[PDB]
Amino acid sequence: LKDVCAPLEKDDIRRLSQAFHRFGIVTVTELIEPHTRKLVRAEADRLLDQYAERRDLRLATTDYTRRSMSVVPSETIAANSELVTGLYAHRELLAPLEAIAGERLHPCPKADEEFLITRQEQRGDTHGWHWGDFSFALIWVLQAPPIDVGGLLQCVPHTTWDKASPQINRYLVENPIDTYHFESGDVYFLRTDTTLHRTIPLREDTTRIILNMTWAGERDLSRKLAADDRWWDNAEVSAARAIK
Ligand SMILES: N[C@@H](CCCC[NH3+])C(=O)O
Ligand SMILES: O=C(O)CCC(=O)C(=O)O
Numbered sequence: 001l002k003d004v005c006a007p008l009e010k011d012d013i014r015r016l017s018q019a020f021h022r023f024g025i026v027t028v029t030e031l032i033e034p035h036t037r038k039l040v041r042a043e044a045d046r047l048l049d050q051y052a053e054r055r056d057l058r059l060a061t062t063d064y065t066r067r068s069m070s071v072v073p074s075e076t077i078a079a080n081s082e083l084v085t086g087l088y089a090h091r092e093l094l095a096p097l098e099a100i101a102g103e104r105l106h107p108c109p110k111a112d113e114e115f116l117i118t119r120q121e122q123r124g125d126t127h128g129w130h131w132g133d134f135s136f137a138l139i140w141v142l143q144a145p146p147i148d149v150g151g152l153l154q155c156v157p158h159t160t161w162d163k164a165s166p167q168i169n170r171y172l173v174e175n176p177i178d179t180y181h182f183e184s185g186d187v188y189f190l191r192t193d194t195t196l197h198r199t200i201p202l203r204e205d206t207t208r209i210i211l212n213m214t215w216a217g218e219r220d221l222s223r224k225l226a227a228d229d230r231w232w233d234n235a236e237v238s239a240a241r242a243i244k
């Protein structure tokens with residue numbers, strides 16, 4: 001892997017950093033060469049065609065919000081994509097992300113959450129309100145419908161995830177919600193542990209595909225509280241309720 005990332009100047013890193021901290025999210029498409037983005041879209045399609053699994057559940061640890069989408073789990077992506085695992089460890093990608101985040105990124109200590117592909121396809125599909133166990137995700141928007149079909153990201157930064165008492169609606173009541181429209185081929189960088197977020201349910205059948213690479217910050221390397229809520233890797237986790 002040779003020319004993954006465009007070079008960002010000092011003032012570009014300042015502007016991206018500022019937005020990333022203020023909003024919990026910033027668009028980083030300009031950082032990744034179009035060919036690389038085209039290669040990832042092709043890889044995700046190949047992975048989905050072989051391994052897509054359906055999820056339809058509500059998650060107890062996020063106030064029973066919905067997860068309705070197909071997925072490709074992390075160990076399956078890792079075992080079958082040298083492109084994705086190479087990019088995940090690529091200095092030319094991690095260096096500027098560390099500059100934007102203002103801290104060092106580490107491989108996710110949980111093998112089941114390095115990577116995730118999701119595909120929303122049905123009217124009503126959604127990635128319901130939630131936070132991440134880890135600090136960082138790079139989200140590759142490989143395919144997104146037009147703005148009026150839905151699938152927009154909503155964020156509330158500067159919050160946190162209390163699995164025993166999530167109080168997601170209180171966080172909405174107490175903070176403005178920011179809404180983002182991403183197009184096919186966009187990439188964004190998200191502070192997932194402190195940014196409450198979701199995708200707006202699709203208004204009609206269509207296709208929305210992202211790839212998620214998740215990294216740990218130093219704060220993530222210490223022991224975490226165990227919860228049986230890791231639904232993307234196993235729908236039968238005890239925190240998950242199947243949908244009526
Ligand atoms: N915590 C997320 C899952 C992230 C999996 C990929 N890092 C959720 O509840 O939907
Ligand atoms: O679908 C998206 O744009 C973001 C998905 C998300 O929240 C995640 O992958 O953890």
Ligand SMILES: [Cl-]
Nearest residue numbers: 131132133192
């Ligand atoms: Cl997340």
Ligand SMILES: [Fe+2]
Nearest residue numbers: 131132192197
């Ligand atoms: Fe997320």
